[PDB]
Structures are given as C-alpha cells and as structure tokens.
Amino acid sequence: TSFGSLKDEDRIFTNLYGRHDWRLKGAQSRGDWYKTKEILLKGPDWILGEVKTSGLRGRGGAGFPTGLKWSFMNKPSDGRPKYLVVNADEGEPGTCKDREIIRHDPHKLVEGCLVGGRAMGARAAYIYIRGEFYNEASNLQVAIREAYEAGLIGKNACGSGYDFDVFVVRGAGAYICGEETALIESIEGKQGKPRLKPPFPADVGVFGCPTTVANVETVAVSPTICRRGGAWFASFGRERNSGTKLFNISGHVNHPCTVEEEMSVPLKELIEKHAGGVIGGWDNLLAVIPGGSSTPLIPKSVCETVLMDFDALVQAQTGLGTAAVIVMDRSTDIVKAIARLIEFYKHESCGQCTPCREGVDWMNKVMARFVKGDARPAEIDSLWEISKQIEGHTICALGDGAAWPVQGLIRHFRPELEERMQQFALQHQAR
C-alpha cells in the first residue's frame, strides 16, 4: 500500500502559513470550538478511549502512546491538584512546527489543552513556551484572553461545569529545559535540571502534584480526533503509525518549508514534492537527518527507499524524532556539520551528571580535531567507545542524543574521516 498525497480536507492544521485569521472568529470559522461541551460531557474515559483507538503517538521526540500516558494520569485524586504541562520549548535544531502551531493555531492549542485537562482530570494547564518566541507567546496570550472572554475556558468551561485554567509560562534559553522533567524544574523557578525516574511525572510532577507533559502538536490534534473519530486517524498511516505529521524540510533543498503529510510518506517523495528536491537534483544528495540533531544521519542509499515513519526509520538505524528533515548535498562538509551539532550539544548540556557533562565536552574536542584531520585512525574507535559510554548512563536523554549523530557519522562516513586524517598527515610531513 502507498501513503502520502494528503488532502486539504483531511489536514488537521488548517491556517498553516498564516494566510487566514488566527483569532477566535477565524478559528470558529473552521471547525475549532465545536461541540466541546458535548465532548466534555462525554467525559474522561470516552476521550481516553478515542485517543487510544486513534493510536496517536508522542509528536515531540520519543513516540509513546498518548492514550497510555493519559490513562496513567487518569488515577483517582488524592487531595492534590492536577496539571497538564504543554511543552513548547522547540529547541531541537531543524524544528519549527511548534512555532507555526502556536503562532497560527493558538485556539486549536487552547482547545486541545482544555480537552486534555478534561481527559486527565486536570485543574490547570501550563503552556511552557520558550523565551525566544516572544511574539508567538503574545499571540497565545491574546488567544487565551479571547477564549476566557468568550467563556470557553475558565470556570464552567464551555458551559460544562468543569473548571479549567490555562497559564502561559515563558522560559529562558535552555534546550535542556525543553525536556519534560527539566520543564517541570524550570516552572518551579529552579535551574532546570532533569529529575530521575521514579518518581514519574504522572505521580509527582510540578509542585509535587500529578502532571502530564504533552507536546503542542499532540494536544492540538487531540480535539480534532475527539470531534472526528479515530478510526479515521488510524486509517491515515500505517498500522501502528497512525495520523498526520508536520515535517520541517530544511537545509540544502530548493524550497525549505513546513508541511503536513501522512505518517508513512516516503522521504524521497516528500522532498521532491513539497520542497522542490535537492538543489543539484536527487543525484546531488549526500545525507539526510530525518529527526533533528538527536537522530543519526543516513546516506543517499538508505534515503532512496525509506518511509518517514517511526518503525521505518528505526529499522534504518535512525529515528523519527521531531520529523525535522535536514538535507545535505554532495558539496558540504559532513564532518564539520556533525562537529557543529556536537558543539551545540556541548553548549546546551545542563552539566548535572558526569557522563553527559564530561563526555560531551570530550567528544566536542575530538570532533574539532577530526574536522581538520589532526588525529589518528585509532581514535575513531575510541570516539565510538566513549559515545557508547555516554549513551544509557545519563540521567536524561540529551546524553543519549548527543552520541547518536556521532555514531551515525562514524558508521556511514568513516572513509571520509580516514581520508582527512591521511591528507593531514601528508600535509604536515611535507614540512
């Protein structure tokens, strides 16, 4: 079976590109804020079942069943408040979808927050938006004010008797505060260093209360799933990879953009259709990073026949991640690009725990020596081993994600590294 060629009548995120009104009047002109009271009266179990049938997976990196997570938070109350934290710290390089959703579909985001809060029995929803997105945060606040004035959220939300608050928390610059436990720590006015698990956020979250952290895209697609079916959402995509997805195609491509497509569209077709293809044509392709910095890269051979899907990319020794497709053509320094990614991880490391802190600095130094050839061929395996020592021995997943691009570079472009080292040795021995 073939996937892709999504129809505008089925694309969830209308008003993308900001060609229409993003206010409450415009959002209500589309399907937003329709029978929300009826959904709330249907209640938590109905919403959870609908999400589980739709088979939605986490859209902000690691893809876990959102139905399972929200059911985890669906435990009975114990005398403590309940919070839904919506992650909007779009710090992963290559990713712009959350920015587009916040800037052009803020009422969709707010309705999704209300629906998720009803599903989880949450009194409040804190939308943690990164501090660079000042205008996006202001648009979100204006949309929240319009919703409150219209009575859609607040006390007796949508005329359903459910009391729900929506606060917007602007963070500072911290790709680590992008993480869920670091998100929780920064909301509490602390440094923003990830916690250990257990306790899980669904058990002890922000302020020590049960919280559920969900991505902006996930919460935004929740109310459309509720109003529509979820058999429909499951129909779009593969068997265990259902729904639509926002892809940010960027890099050495003709028409970099953000688009919405199905969950199993082949990478080559997506690049050739929605981006105009590589600048020098498909024969000029060198490598593609399909999920932002965290996911490894794949060469042209793998990209020739590969599906932009969770399992399809996992089978290719990669990951879907945030569906950020960075394209590199033949006329690029792949070693320098990976060194720049590792330098990014060095700057954004929170420094709490020894493996990531020390090892990421060490890998940055080794890569910086690699890009100029000032190394030996025996250091490639040493770099592989130290990257394997960082992965799985850290508190959070930033350390794991700082080793995967290195592993991908070593796995697919070892001849380039060896050639550069040999060239440097010849250049220096001529003195």
Partner 1 sequence: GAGGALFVHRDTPENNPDTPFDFTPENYKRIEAIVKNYPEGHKAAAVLPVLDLAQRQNGWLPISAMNKVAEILQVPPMRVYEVATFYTMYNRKPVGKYHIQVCTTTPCMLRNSDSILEAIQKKLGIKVGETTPDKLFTLIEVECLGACVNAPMVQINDNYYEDLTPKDIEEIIDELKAGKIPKPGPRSGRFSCEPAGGLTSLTEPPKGPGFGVQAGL
Partner 2 sequence: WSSTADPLSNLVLTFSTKEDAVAFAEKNGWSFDVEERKVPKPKSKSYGANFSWNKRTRVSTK
Partner 3 sequence: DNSTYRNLQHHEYSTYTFLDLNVELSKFRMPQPSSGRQSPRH
Ligand X SMILES: Cc1cc2nc3c(=O)[nH]c(=O)nc-3n(C[C@H](O)[C@H](O)[C@H](O)COP(=O)(O)O)c2cc1C
- Specify binding-site residues for FMN: 59-60, 62, 69, 87, 90-91, 98, 178, 180, 213, 215, 218
Instruction: Enumerate binding residues for partner 2 (CB under 8 A).
Output: 80, 185, 190-191, 193, 195-196, 198-199, 203-204, 207-209, 352
Site for ligand X in 183-222 (CB under 6 A): 213-215, 218
Q: Of these partners, ligand X, partner 2, partner 1, none, which one is at the site of residue 39 (CB under 5 to 8 Å by kind)?
A: partner 1
What is residue 178's DSSP assignment? T
State yes or no: residue 7 binds partner 3 (CB under 8 A).
no
Q: Which residues of 136-161 are buried (b: 16+ CB within 10 A; e: fewer)?
A: bbebbbebbebbbeeebbbeebbebe
Q: How far apart, in whole angstroms, are the C-alpha atoms of residue 106 and residue 111?
A: 9
Rule CB under 8 A: is residue 382 a binding residue for partner 3?
Answer: no
Edge to edge, the sheet with strand 124-129 lists 165-170, 124-129, 83-88, 211-215
Interactions with partner 3, residue window 115-154 (CB under 8 A): 123, 134-135, 137-139, 141-142, 144-145, 148-149, 154
d(CA 272, CA 256): 11
SS3 342: helix
The interface partner of residue 26, options being partner 3, ligand SF4, partner 2, none and the CB cut-off 5 to 8 Å by kind, is partner 3
| DSSP strand pairing (244-251 vs 324-329) | parallel
* Contact present, 405 and 293 (Cβ < 8 Å): yes
Closest contact distance (angstroms) between CB of 395 and partner 3 is 23
Both ends of the chain: CA-CA distance in Å?
61
In the chain, what's the furthest Cα-to-Cα distance?
82
The pattern of x and - marking residues 218 through 257 that bind partner 1 according to CB under 8 A reads: --------xxxx--x---------------xxxxx-xxxx
Residues sharing a CB contact under 8 Å with residue 294, sequence separation 6 or more, in sequence order = 61, 92, 319, 321, 397, 400, 401, 404, 405
Q: Which residue has the tokens 């985001």?
A: 109
Interface pattern 281-320 for partner 1 (x via CB under 8 A): ------------x---------------------------
Partner from ligand SF4, ligand X, partner 3, none binding residue 163, C-beta < 5-8 Å depending on class: partner 3
CB of 407 to ligand SF4, least distance (A): 16
Identify what 37 binds: ligand X, partner 1, partner 2, none; CB under 5 to 8 Å per kind. none
Smaller CB distance to ligand SF4: residue 110 or 356?
A: 356
Question: In the complex, which residues of this chain contact ligand X (CB under 6 A)?
Answer: 58-62, 66, 87, 89-92, 98, 175-176, 178-180, 213-215, 218, 396-398
